[PDB]
Design goal:
67 residues, Chromo domain-containing protein, nuclear protein, chromodomain, globular, three-stranded antiparallel beta sheet, alpha+beta, HP1, 25% strand, OB fold (Dihydrolipoamide Acetyltransferase, E2P)
């Protein structure tokens, strides 16, 4: 059935851009903000969990630092 709940944005999430990134013990982590709502807080999403949920900005940040 794929039942869904009720929340803001039709399952897409509106983020500003990838604040920064860092790996630990071999585990990459992408720290993205929330529309500049809390550039100090932000959320740390694995490199394999940030490009899938925020691949939009992910390919705009890392793709810029990688070169």
């Amino acid at each position: 059935m794929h039942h869904h709940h009720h929340h803001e944005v039709p399952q897409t999430f509106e983020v500003e851009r990838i604040v920064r990134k860092k790996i630990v013990h071999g585990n990459t982590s992408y720290l993205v903000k929330w529309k500049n709502y809390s550039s100090k807080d932000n959320t740390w999403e694995t490199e394999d969990d940030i490009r899938t949920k925020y691949g939009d900005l992910v390919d705009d940040f890392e793709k810029n630092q990688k070169k």
